[PDB]
């Protein structure tokens, strides 16, 4: 599996709400969370089709570039 830390933004990212659960199988396409920026709102969908294995962040909590968000478990192989 691989963990997904904050992407390349250039400042501080803040979590507004978490619309995902643990053990939930997402798909490369749907959204995952909504971070905020100095003067703009961004989004973070599922960068990998797998099931939520663990969570290293909380909703409403603020994190800085380099902070891990969640870990997707795509298993060994798929299809």
Could you tell me the residue ranges of all domains in the chain?
A: 1-79
How many other C-beta atoms can be found within 10 angstroms of the C-beta atom of residue 59?
A: 13
The pair of three-digit structure tokens given for residue 44, joined into one six-digit string: 């973070």
Residue 21 and residue 16: Cα distance in Å, rounded? 15
Q: Return d(Cα 79, Cα 59) in angstroms, integer.
A: 32
Cα-based distances in Å from 77 to 1, 29, 30, 63, 69: 10, 19, 21, 31, 23
What distance in Å separates the CA atoms of residue 77 and residue 72, rounded to the nearest whole number?
13
Please report the sign of the dihedral spanned by the C-alpha atoms of residue 62, residue 28, residue 31, residue 26.
Answer: negative
CATH code at 1-79: 2.40.50.100
List the structure tokens of 28.
């490369």
- Taking CB atoms within 8 Å and a gap of at least 24, the contacts of 29-38 are 32/70, 33/69, 35/6, 35/9, 37/9, 37/11, 37/13, 38/11
How far out from the chain centre does Cα 29 lie?
12
């Amino acid at each position: 599996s691989e963990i997904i830390r904050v992407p390349d933004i250039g400042g501080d990212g803040e979590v507004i709400e978490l619309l995902v659960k643990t053990g939930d199988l997402i798909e490369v396409e749907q959204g995952l969370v909504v971070l905020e920026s100095a003067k703009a709102s961004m989004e973070v969908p599922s960068p990998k089709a797998g099931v939520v294995k663990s969570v290293s962040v909380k909703l409403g909590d603020k994190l800085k570039e380099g902070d891990a968000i969640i870990e997707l478990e795509p298993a060994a192989g798929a299809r």
